[model samples]
Target chain A: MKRLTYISKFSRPLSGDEIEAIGRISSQKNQQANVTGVLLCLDGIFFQILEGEAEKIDRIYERILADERHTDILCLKSEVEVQERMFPDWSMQTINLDENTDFLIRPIKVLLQTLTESHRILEKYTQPSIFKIISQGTNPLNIRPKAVEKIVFFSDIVSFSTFAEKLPVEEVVSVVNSYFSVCTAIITRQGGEVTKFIGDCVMAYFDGDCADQAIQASLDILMELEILRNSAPEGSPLRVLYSGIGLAKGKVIEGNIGSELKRDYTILGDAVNVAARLEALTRQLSQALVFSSEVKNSATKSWNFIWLTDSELKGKSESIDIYSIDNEMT
Target chain B: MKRLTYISKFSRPLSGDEIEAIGRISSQKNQQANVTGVLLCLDGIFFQILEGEAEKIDRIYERILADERHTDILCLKSEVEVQERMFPDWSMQTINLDENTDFLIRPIKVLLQTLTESHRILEKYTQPSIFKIISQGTNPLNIRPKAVEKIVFFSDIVSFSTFAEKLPVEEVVSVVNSYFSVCTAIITRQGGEVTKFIGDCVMAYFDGDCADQAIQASLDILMELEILRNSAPEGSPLRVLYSGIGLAKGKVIEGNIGSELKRDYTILGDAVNVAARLEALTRQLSQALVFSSEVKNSATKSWNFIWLTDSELKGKSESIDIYSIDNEMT
Candidate 1:
């Protein structure tokens, strides 16, 4: 199975009916192919993520690229081996983000536009389950947070305090959003799910089956970060932005945490700690990527991993063998 | 400045006008004495945190003790020394919590009532700064996250996964909430502000001045945990619940972070990581509390701290000395 995502600008402004007409027909065809995903349009821009057979995703992308109704097409992610579908229930949930949205759904469209760099937020809206929950509300008490096995991934800006201290707050927001958007795009396309973006940190993971996807996402993120860092022709704080990622595979409980009044859905476990600790080490190790023995063991041996140390990760009682991989993108 | 927080209940249910009249008079008297804090009531329970000169606070507490309006005069926290005030602007801002709150401010009262165990949430409601923000709507862009020095605190249940898996989720929430309520009450009393409750993990901080308060909070929490552990009479999983606390002091950025739509006020820095790492280490060390050298340096020499090791704290370039204190409460 594969999942492909892309964004494109329309040749012309799309009317509500015209967009719905296209969505209705495309959805009918996509369902026949057993594809599941969503189509979202805002202003003159359109974004979509489709999951199906490799050939089917290829066909969809080709059809999208060749279509005259859209232009300036860019592929955000092309996951060759996606283990599961994020939007399994949605054959095609098309949303005209700019029009006909009730208050409940309008904020997300505004949210999507506000932080478009991270297409992951856009993907969240496309998920049929979230839409189902919000569109038709239910009792929160019925939802019990559960434990699940995952290959957790964590990343954060190196010396981000420098930015907060030196840069303007507005610029900091812009830059942090840029960082999140780029990292999230890569993480999602590499067959992973971004759980949350905490300040200058990005928290994400892959399902238990393979650690390779998470490993690749870490490597891929640094490459884009370097590009974005250089994209800042502006100044020192802007140009020197760098990032580090950590990966750990284990069991974690995923649920709504905190007081009921201010609850947030987040994951918790030793693996989460290991992953975060590893990311924190990236600064001191002077390396962009690091992982625990668990991630090293769970992932496929497609890449070289240099042994760093039998390092004592803060919360863990005993030291675990840590490893890292340098970015070979250059 | 010293801040002392305590919880008590009214002798009987008081009417809104009566509570308001008391608050109006108390606010005026507190202002004259240069004492600042809030008074909150839910059901028949009253919670207050008073900050002033030692003698003045002593005078106020004694006055309250001599009065007949409130009963069950147990102190949740008593700080002998304090550096700064959390609610500096308010002079006894009293909230009836049960009455006369607009929708905007009502949820917090509801929120406070729901998570009463963690009096930290209760203190937050009493904050004049937070109250001012909610009462007056404003654009978020005007506020910027800034860097500040802090003594960070982190704690989580040991073997929490066992609870998530072995016990029913409803029970898990109950147990976790109970743990948080107890820990929060201690943390805030010791002049620490809890930034968040991340699932089973609690993230908090004491302003960089005195590490002794955070240290005391950690030790005090363990005593309460022991009491709570024994409080569970029905079963084994409930009886065996244990916890660990980690403390680290350093610089961090504090502000609202996230996309415009989903922003959260959180602190970000190496100190945040270090504290969390130490807390994570608690499970392995088989200790109730662990803290970094920075905290040891800043705190006074009132207690014994056994040198644990020159630990390789996950994110640091070099290993630093770590220390711990046993649960001497036994």
Candidate 2:
């Protein structure tokens, strides 16, 4: 039999009763189809792993896709054949960490192993699935480039190399850890996903409605790090620390790239490059935050964006209009 | 004149008209007091850069603090003497990049320079301000130890050193860059800040409500690297790549440390050390993700956590309950 798993987000939060009712109905239906799976609900997101004939799982997902209760359904793992059923006991065993209501949840060891094995596949699928759905709604196997709007964010630690050379290994680790924690907390809070952490820098993106989130998260990082800046222990290596953030929004190709075994689910195109360029601009301008015209135009709300200059950023052929956020605004 | 600049956020989003109204009122008040500044608003957050006597700016901020529209008002650039007004031409010349509205905004180069110089001071003051407020509310300068909760995350590139020896320098840089980009992005997306990108591993943390984000991001990194795992470009030194993530949450002393001239903002405590130990456990468990009871309890949402085993993590005398996320939660 083949198994398929998909993760999706609810359009809105659901109460415990609603979740239980959905579980009850899913269990009943799966029993008739001879499908066994587990459903996990955290906050508003649902991760359902189904085991059955490949087509049957696909049909089930199709039905789920049609259901309006959950939206933005993305297939994470698909059409992987298995000799035996992982969840042979129950037609549908619901594991809601939020709901302490499950009485029959077995030892999570077996399930944990299964999840780990499958997670690699899930991660493998998320980026491709986005392009697939956008370009070919019905076909899960199709892979191609598609233009998508996304908010790109870039940030770097100010004068980081100096710190690396000046401080002890553990202390350097401590500084980076503190800065990243602050940055990550704000980024995640604003619904942005971090894409990578370069040496002394970070890159992230938001799929939709994320410019505001990115900007807010950036501001929050600066504000929160204030405490860390002032509370340096006496005889510390440096007097202060800060970060420069940049955001840009534009079209990019979202797809899987690299060799078969070593693939990357990432976005490519000028927008991504432009975001990094803008981040680099922060240092030259000596501002805490910077952004491109794209971000300024796409932002959901108004903010104090001061006109900086229209200049060509490195690696870009054309000059892009740039702006900096005046941290002090009424 | 001594200039002081600070940033704050509104409890709720405001309309454009409301922002404009605040701008008009602020300009009127500041003009009378010979205070010159610019106000930038994005979403509901406000960054007001004020130029005036130190005491006058302080008094203005006090008036603003008393204003009920916003709270969490904190000074960023405080009490710095400046030779001239950065925005002397217009009283509260409001700059909002949204409407292309700043008809009167002048060259940001001078102001940008001024802000950047003051920014270092702002960065220096941020951490201490928090401690001062918490320990000595009314005082601007104070120091004390305070316990804080944080999420500590650690991870390492599996078999990374093998690659360091096997690949050419360029390819090594390529591999490390690719790995880090994927890792950093996921970490930031989940609201976890990357603390350091060690030789082959990464360490990061989350202040509050981040374990779930951290775990999910980790899975994404592994899943995305599957292609990298299978598809090494022809003649590529490596065949596959993977990362293991460990998480812990506990009280840590968050502050700046190091010697004078090269200080760092960092955390110290057993929790931080324990987190590294848990990350080490991932190798032994042969799992991609692992966590301690501290993290399992502190997670804001429910995840499929399976009881792994009880063991004394490295560097600790007492055995602790360890758990791993069920990748296959059927």
lDDT of 1 at A70: 87
Choose the strongest candidate by TM-score: 1
- Please give the TM-score that candidate 1 achieves against the real structure: 0.52
lDDT of 2 by residue, A1-330 (tens): 877656666777788788889899999999999999877765566767788987777788788888878875655435454787866877887766554433212112222222232222222213332333432223322345455789888888777756644565556656765666667667767777655555456667887566777778888877787766677788765346777877888765554433211233455545666777777777776677888877777777888878887465776657788876776620
Q: Give candidate 1's whole-model lDDT.
A: 0.69
- Which has the greatest DockQ? 1
lDDT of 1 by residue, A161-255 (tens): 66766766556767776777787677768777666666588888788867888877777777777777777676646577788888888877766
All models: lDDT?
A: 0.69, 0.62
Candidate 1 per-residue lDDT, tens place, B43-146, comes to: 88877778888899999888988768887665544565688775777898776657645532332233233223222222222222232233233333356666
